[PDB]
């Protein structure tokens, strides 16, 4: 939490038509910086100049007059921050929730269960089956699919202020990646206290992204649509992006090998509801621009801010989409034929 004199990392050859205009601005462009700073050495009385590469998201400008290009980490503004220990891992392991003796868990084995009310087929267990603690948004990853068919659940669908929880029957592979070979450096500040920072970009400046099959996504989009259309009086249902909120809410968030992602789900929700297939053309992958950030605070206020140390070298993980979290726009509209 000190001053950072940051500069963008490498020049480029951006040209072509037109030319008369001058300054461009785009909110969707994942980019790194080359921040420089002084930090304390082994002894309090001395300090040295280090440089690190920080995601633009993780830094914020400060208006100093004595110098230019001055930034600070977003947290020095609000909360303390610690770095995830190298030894520990936030890999979602299946954990079993078990009841004490004299207690018991009851498992509903109904294949077309609604969430509430009677269960015809029940079975007692002492422990819950393996449940991986996956933290994601919009898309429910690596979860349990529905046995019967894809399911929609809500405390009451009519109350637009309560989340729709979709459960797919067949999973949809999603393969996300940070393709750049990022070298990392250890920066020490005493006594032996050190933090890993990204050092260099070996090779091309590549951009983070996710991949879903267009044929396989658009299908479940349809299959979900058909199940939704059944609930809202055969009204033709349509999908769109998030109306606002924190990035984590207006994007698909998760972590691969520890780095935390924020993928633009705009592409997944353009709509494309009418199925013609176009002679099975215009259908390969559907790629989403992903943004990556290191200083991160979950659970809002409860808990401190975390700095995710970079994993050296390019990374890529594949999860299976097993469900979704949706919310309906609700107001008076065209009674016939509105939707």
């Amino acid at each position, epitope marked *: 939490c000190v001053t950072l004199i940051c500069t963008n990392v490498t020049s480029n*050859s951006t040209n072509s038509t037109n030319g008369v205009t001058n300054n461009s601005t785009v909110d969707y462009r994942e980019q790194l910086k080359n921040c420089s700073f002084n930090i304390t050495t082994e002894i309090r009385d001395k300090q040295r100049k280090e440089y690190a590469l920080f995601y633009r998201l993780d830094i914020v400008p400060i208006n100093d007059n004595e110098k230019n290009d001055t930034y600070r980490l977003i947290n020095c503004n609000v909360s303390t921050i610690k770095q995830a220990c190298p030894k520990v891992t936030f890999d979602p392991i299946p954990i079993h929730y078990c009841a004490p003796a004299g207690f018991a868990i009851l498992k509903c084995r109904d294949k077309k269960f609604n969430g509430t009310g009677p269960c015809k087929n029940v079975s007692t267990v002492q422990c819950t089956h393996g449940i991986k603690p996956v933290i994601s948004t919009q898309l429910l990853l690596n979860g349990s699919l529905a046995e019967g068919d894809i399911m929609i659940r809500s405390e009451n669908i009519t109350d637009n202020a309560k989340t729709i929880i979709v459960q797919l029957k067949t999973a949809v592979n999603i393969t996300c990646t940070r393709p750049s070979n990022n070298t990392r450096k250890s920066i020490r500040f005493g006594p032996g206290q050190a933090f890993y920072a990204t050092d260099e970009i*070996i*090779g091309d400046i590549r951009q983070a992204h996710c991949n879903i099959s267009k044929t396989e996504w658009e299908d479940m989009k349809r299959n979900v649509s058909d199940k939704l259309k059944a609930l809202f009086n055969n009204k033709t249902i349509i999908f769109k992006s998030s109306s606002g909120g924190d990035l984590e809410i207006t994007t698909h968030s998760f972590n691969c090998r520890g780095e935390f992602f924020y993928c633009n789900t705009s592409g997944l929700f353009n709509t494309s509801g009418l199925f013609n297939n176009n002679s099975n053309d215009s259908s390969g992958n559907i790629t989403l621009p992903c943004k990556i950030k290191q200083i991160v605070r979950m659970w809002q206020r409860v808990g401190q801010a975390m700095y995710a140390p970079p994993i050296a070298g390019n990374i890529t993980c594949r999860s299976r989409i097993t469900g979704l979290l949706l919310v309906r726009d609700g107001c008076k509209s065209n009674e016939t034929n509105g939707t």
Partner: antibody, heavy 132, light 108 residues
Framework: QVHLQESGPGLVKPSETLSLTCNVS????????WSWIRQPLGKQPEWIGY???????NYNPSLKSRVHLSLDKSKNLVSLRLTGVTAADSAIYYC??????????????????????????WGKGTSVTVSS | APTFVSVAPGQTARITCGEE??????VIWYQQRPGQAPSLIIY??????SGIPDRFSGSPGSTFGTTATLTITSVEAGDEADYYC????????????FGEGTTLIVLS
């Protein structure tokens, strides 16, 4: 046997615009991307700029201000104009068909690629001297 | 700058140009002789136009922190020339002059 060559004045004095011309044959002038190259005595070749019809042109930043390229259709030939010359500009010049392409290394969608230019056939070379 | 290398007639010569790569490059190689203008030998690192043999090998654009080495197997006498090259890198702005060419020679 597609071949070409240029035609210049030989000598120009300072503070004068150096005009040059690259007469061509074998193929059309519309059907090609066109370049200009100069190489002094015992030095490496310097890429001047390149041009194509439909209002497309790009220059070397060193002399993006001074050079003014042109293009004649019917005559099948190219042109050049370099203002405010000095002894620095004196070099042997050339003109060549600039065959271009695209180098892709990542996601095309995100513009993770770049376009490059090679020149497969050269002229003879117009020797240009700049002295008072 | 150093631009010379000695190789016997029948052996192989490897000549280098430009700074080490940062990203994927599209390295174009040329060859010039006295009087004549520079001629194209290789484009896109290892692709060659009409009239150039297979002996002319080139560094792949795929490598990083690496100098561009033009390798010519079984060096011919009439191949002694200036080899100015033109580098197109992903991570550096368009170069508008060519690189220094390791001039080629033969022992005997």
């Amino acid at each position: 046997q597609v071949h070409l060559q240029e035609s210049g004045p030989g000598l120009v004095k300072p503070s004068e615009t150096l005009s040059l011309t690259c007469n061509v044959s074998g193929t059309l002038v519309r059907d090609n991307y066109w370049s200009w190259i100069r190489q002094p005595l015992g030095k490496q070749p310097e890429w001047i700029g390149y041009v194509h019809d439909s209002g497309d042109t790009n220059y070397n930043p060193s002399l993006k201000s001074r050079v003014h390229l042109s293009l004649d259709k019917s005559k099948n030939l190219v042109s050049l104009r370099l203002t405010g010359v000095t002894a620095a500009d004196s070099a042997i010049y050339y003109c060549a068909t600039t065959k271009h392409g695209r180098r892709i290394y990542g996601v095309v969608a995100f513009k993770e690629w770049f376009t490059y230019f090679y020149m497969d056939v050269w002229g003879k070379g117009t020797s240009v001297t700049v002295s008072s | 700058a150093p631009t010379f290398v000695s190789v016997a007639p029948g052996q192989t010569a490897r000549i280098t140009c430009g700074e080490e790569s940062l990203g994927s490059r599209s390295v174009i190689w040329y060859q010039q002789r006295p009087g004549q203008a520079p001629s194209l030998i290789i484009y896109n690192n290892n692709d060659r136009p009409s009239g150039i043999p297979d002996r002319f090998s080139g560094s792949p654009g795929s490598t990083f922190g690496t100098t561009a080495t033009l390798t010519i197997t079984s060096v011919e006498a009439g191949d002694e020339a200036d080899y100015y090259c033109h580098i197109w890198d992903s991570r550096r702005p368009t170069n508008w002059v060519f690189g220094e060419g390791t001039t080629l020679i033969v022992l005997s």
